[PDB]
């Protein structure tokens, strides 16, 4: 038997509300003006480079802010486009 292996991914926080955050996962960090785009516009510009992270399981997300680069941990991705996952932990990079 071995320890529970969790998945992880890195991305930049572009939108954050009390229930979820939208992360961009392109190599380069989003440009300053990408932070005035709507969710619909982000979906178009960063197609296949977006992840939605559900924050219901995190005790406090006050420090999870737009512009932060983070690593998130989760068990599995939901069957969605963009992919989405309920995260168990995050780390500010």
Swiss-Prot record:
Keywords: Signal
Protein name per Swiss-Prot or TrEMBL: Uncharacterized protein YobA
Whole-protein residues included: 29 to 120 of 120
């Amino acid at each position: 038997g071995d320890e529970t292996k969790m998945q992880s991914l890195v991305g930049y926080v572009v939108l954050k509300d009390n229930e979820r955050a939208i992360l961009i996962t392109d190599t380069k960090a989003p440009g300053k003006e990408d932070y005035n785009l709507s969710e619909g516009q982000l979906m178009n510009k960063f197609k296949n480079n977006i992840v939605i992270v559900g924050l219901s399981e995190i005790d406090n997300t006050d420090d999870l802010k737009r512009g932060e680069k983070i690593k998130v941990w989760f068990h599995t991705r939901k069957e969605s486009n963009p992919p989405s996952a309920t995260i168990q932990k995050y780390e500010l990079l």
